[PDB]
């Protein structure tokens, strides 16, 4: 419990914990962490069978092994052949807002399982969505300069809001569990297709699989650490 | 030194070749297990020896350079605060992080962070921090260094307690 787990990335500050006894047991949420408030699963569980989820009462395994099983809040509601299109839809619905952003949907392809979470208490953060729906080049962040202009347009006027971004499938909320099934780009710049010796050395973008991109890495930090200047040149403790 | 930094960078770049080859080797099933050890145990063993040799040689290169004017070096030569390990982490490579004597574990399924791909045992993935404090750490290097950091804080708490009772 007091050790800094990998799955704490982006959700809990890696630096702000108290020395002593409470070390690692008292944590602090990172700047962009949020916690699910809870949603009713009925609608989803309904949509699910409308979309081909075979009821468990009629499931015969030796007769369809390749089937993927679906769970909602821990309940095994059923089985579904060709879950791929259901998942496409589920994500589209959530990116519209017809399914609450707060809802976590994960598809473990190798494990033949699709799990949905609607309960409260799940910690999540927001990430840039990256899809190749863009013809012109390759895979890109769905947020473009035109969007940012509107954002800043509404700033300066002190109406394009954070919610707008969510509604237009530009950003998504993601919990540790779903975080398992995605590949995240650190800088939106390593989505690109004689070096300053003073800079720190970085690794490559050998990824044509990016599904998301960090809004900004300095956001893994909590409030206290967000006040330290150049925390990345300091010794950890 | 401008040149020293080039020498240091290549010194590590060399360790990532040695480690990359031990991988292709092991991925081909050519590595031979050392009696009383798993392939994976001796695999790790070598990558850790490689990386440390790098860290070390990267540190000496930085040590050698510093002139006598160098104040950090002047403190060291006299005895007051500061060691090789300190100069090395500030100037040359910071080193390899680690929790419980091993490289950063696959917290997520088959990966250290969601930014890597599964089954990536490279040094960048598993916790080696190439950069020095001077150059700054990358987000991944930063988290991994915090994981290692926390381990120390934790048992500084323990070590603290357990010794005040033993002494009594």
């Amino acid at each position: 419990p007091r050790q800094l787990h990998n799955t704490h990335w982006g959700l809990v500050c890696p630096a702000e914990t108290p020395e002593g006894q409470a070390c690692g047991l008292v944590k602090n949420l990172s700047l962009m962490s949020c916690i699910s408030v809870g949603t009713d699963p009925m609608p989803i569980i309904t949509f699910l069978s409308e979309w081909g989820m075979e009821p468990l009462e009629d499931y015969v395994p030796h007769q369809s092994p390749d089937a993927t099983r679906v769970f909602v809040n821990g309940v095994w509601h059923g089985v579904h052949r060709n879950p791929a299109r259901l998942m496409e839809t589920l994500r589209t619905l959530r990116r519209k807002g017809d399914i609450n952003p707060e809802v976590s949907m994960i598809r473990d392809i190798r494990e033949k399982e699709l799990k949905i979470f609607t309960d409260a208490g799940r910690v999540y953060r927001p990430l840039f969505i990256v899809e190749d729906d863009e013809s012109l080049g390759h895979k890109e962040l769905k947020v473009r300069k035109g969007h940012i202009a509107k954002l800043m347009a509404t700033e300066y006027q002190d109406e394009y809001t954070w919610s707008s971004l969510l509604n237009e499938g530009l950003v998504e909320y993601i919990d540790a569990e779903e975080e398992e099934s995605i590949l995240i780009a650190m800088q939106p710049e390593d989505l690109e297709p004689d070096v300053d010796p003073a800079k720190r050395i970085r690794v490559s973008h050998h990824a044509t699989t990016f599904t998301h991109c960090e809004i900004h890495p300095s956001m893994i930090l909590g409030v206290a650490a967000s006040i330290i200047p150049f925390p990345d040149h300091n010794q950890s403790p | 030194d401008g040149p020293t930094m080039r020498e240091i960078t290549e010194t590590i770049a060399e360790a990532k070749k040695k480690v990359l080859d031990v991988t292709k080797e092991a991925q081909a099933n050519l590595l031979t297990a050392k009696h009383g050890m798993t392939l994976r145990e001796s695999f790790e063993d070598n990558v850790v020896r490689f990386l440390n040799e790098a860290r070390d040689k990267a540190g000496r290169l930085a040590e050698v350079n510093l002139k006598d004017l160098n104040n950090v070096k002047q403190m060291v030569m006299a005895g007051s605060k500061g060691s090789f390990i300190n100069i090395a982490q500030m100037s040359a490579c910071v080193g390899q992080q680690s929790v419980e004597g091993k490289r950063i574990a696959f917290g997520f399924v088959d990966r250290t962070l969601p930014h890597f791909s599964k089954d990536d045992y490279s040094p960048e993935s598993k916790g080696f921090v190439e950069n020095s404090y001077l150059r700054g750490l990358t987000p991944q290097e930063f988290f991994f260094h915090a994981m290692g950091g926390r381990e120390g804080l934790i048992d500084t708490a323990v070590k603290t307690a357990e010794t005040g009772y033993i002494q009594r």
């Binding site: - | 850790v48 490289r103 290692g148 950091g149």
Partner: peptide
């Protein structure tokens, strides 16, 4: 901090 056979 440093590496294996050293501190974390």
């Amino acid at each position: 901090i440093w590496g294996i056979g050293c501190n974390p």
